[PDB]
């Protein structure tokens, strides 16, 4: 099954904010750094600024239309590198889908904290978050229905991370 890439080597479609602008958006998603490169390309920063409080970042898989993850649920992963500015950064990570016929949430989430699956330290670090862990969940939420890669407010302390091929992935045929 082919890989789907979510950040590679430029801006994401989507959609990243805040309440009172904490978050470090350039037209309203993540900024792409190129003086932090990974593997001979650039990052994605991820920078909540100051502390307040609501912060989202939307990264959408196909710009905004629905990508049918379900054939990726059994054994697949969201894989990534990633590094911080001084290590133990957590947020909440995780999907949301869309659904019109779906009255009790046209959109649902389904999410976790990175800090289950990885210790950031200021160092890349590979990491691996199988889809089954998340897609799963009894939320009404549709595997085959995915628009977006989701990170969002855990706690208020400002922190900076970075990404590096972001992707989703399944060893299944």
């Known amino acids: 099954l082919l890989d ?9 479609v989507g959609w990243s904010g805040s ?6 958006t350039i037209g309203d998603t993540l900024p792409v750094d190129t003086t932090v490169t990974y593997n001979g390309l650039p990052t994605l920063r991820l920078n909540v600024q100051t502390t307040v409080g609501w912060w989202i970042s939307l990264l959408t898989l196909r710009g905004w239309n629905t990508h049918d993850l379900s054939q990726y649920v059994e054994n697949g992963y969201l894989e990534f590198d990633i590094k911080g500015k001084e290590g133990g950064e957590d947020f ?9 016929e779906r009255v009790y949430g046209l959109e649902i989430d389904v999410t976790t904290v990175i800090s289950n699956y990885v210790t950031v330290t200021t160092d890349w ?31 208020a302390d400002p ?14 045929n």
């Open 92 to 100: 909440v990570i995780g999907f949301r889908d869309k659904v019109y």
């Open 19 to 24: 309440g009172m602008g904490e978050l470090e």
């Open 4 to 12: 789907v890439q979510i950040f590679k080597d430029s801006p994401v």
């Open 159 to 172: 922190f900076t991370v970075w990404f590096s091929d972001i992707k989703i992935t399944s060893e299944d």
């Open 125 to 155: 670090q590979h990491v691996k978050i199988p889809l089954r862990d998340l897609m799963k969940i009894n939320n009404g939420f549709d595997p085959s229905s995915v628009t977006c890669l989701v990170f969002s407010k855990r706690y």
